[PDB]
């Protein structure tokens with residue numbers, strides 16, 4: 317397959333990127349260096365991951381080494397929930413830029429539709445454990461994102477974890493200046509997301525699939541949870557193609573016209589996960605993988621579920 321997808325800002329985005337959530341700060345610099353050495357040109361980052369400085373060390377070294385040019389990289393980060401305030405968006409973006417050693421981002425996403433009270437804590441709680449909301453809505457936050465484009469800090473803006481009706485609100489915003497380029501959502505065979513994907517694609521938004529391997533390192537994993545990487549039905553498809561289960565799980569979203577961002581800090585796996593451009597899943601394989609949907613999410617959070625903008629009460 318072709319390696320990049322055209323966005324509605326006119327730029328091209330690599331369809332495979334390296335995820336960095338949970339990548340330890342003492343390992344992520346090497347992970348990103350290895351990734352760039354073996355062909356990755358897209359890194360998915362976020363301020364809340366607490367490792368952007370270390371990701372940036374790698375990016376900067378590979379630019380300095382002239383392994384790559386800046387124009388050939390596609391660096392993504394995300395505005396955390398405690399920075400949904402007109403007066404905080406630019407500084408949040410600029411902190412990310414400073415940490416990543418960059419003068420622009422290729423794509424900057426609203427990480428979640430929910431705004432939280434600003435302050436030092438990423439999840440400010442009341443004494444009963446509910447997240448403390450911000451009164452600032454997704455439309456005013458979007459206008460603040462648009463300003464970043466108009467200041468040259470970011471080349472594209474988008475959204476993440478927005479449900480159908482939240483994407484629609486964005487698209488229906490009075491005075492909308494820039495459409496979202498991307499909606500980054502969880503997507504894998506147990507959470508296939510057909511409805512939200514069709515809605516977004518029909519509107520020209522590119523979808524990025526996160527947790528494509530089912531996030532086995534998620535901190536809240538339980539033993540009885542389903543496991544994509546161990547599912548013998550998926551292992552059988554992999555065996556048939558002489559690929560690993562992870563490689564099937566990465567190729568799957570690619571053939572749905574999605575971008576996909578598997579995370580690893582293991583050099584061998586970083587390389588394995590990139591070797592997904594020389595085989596094709598059949599239509600029958602694709603439909604079979606889709607059939608495994610069970611509406612199972614890695615990323616949900618009870619403390620945020622009353623927030624008026626919490627995204628997953630809607631069907632999609």
Ligand SMILES: NC(=O)C1=CN([C@@H]2O[C@H](COP(=O)(O)OP(=O)(O)OC[C@H]3O[C@@H](n4cnc5c(N)ncnc54)[C@H](OP(=O)(O)O)[C@@H]3O)[C@@H](O)[C@H]2O)C=CC1
Pocket residue numbers: 334335336337338360361427476477500501525526527528529530531532533545560562563577578579580581582585586588589614615
């Ligand atoms: N926008 C949002 O709200 C969210 C964004 N994301 C983004 O998506 C990225 C990917 O999702 P994430 O939840 O991290 O989980 P993934 O589904 O990418 O799974 C990562 C886990 O899979 C392991 N792994 C990686 N490659 C292989 C392989 N070839 N064989 C076996 N195991 C493998 C990793 O181990 P190891 O590292 O030890 O090799 C790690 O434990 C995140 O890192 C982040 O960048 C994720 C969640 C939410």
Ligand SMILES: O=C(O)COc1cc(F)ccc1C(=S)NCc1ccc(Br)cc1F
Pocket residue numbers: 337362364365366428429430615616617620626
């Ligand atoms: O979010 C990430 O990218 C990956 O996950 C995280 C990454 C972090 F660095 C810190 C927390 C999370 C959590 S707990 N994320 C889930 C989550 C957060 C906020 C809301 Br609204 C709902 C929700 F489901």
Ligand SMILES: [Cl-]
Pocket residue numbers: 362363364365394395396397427
């Ligand atoms: Cl963030």
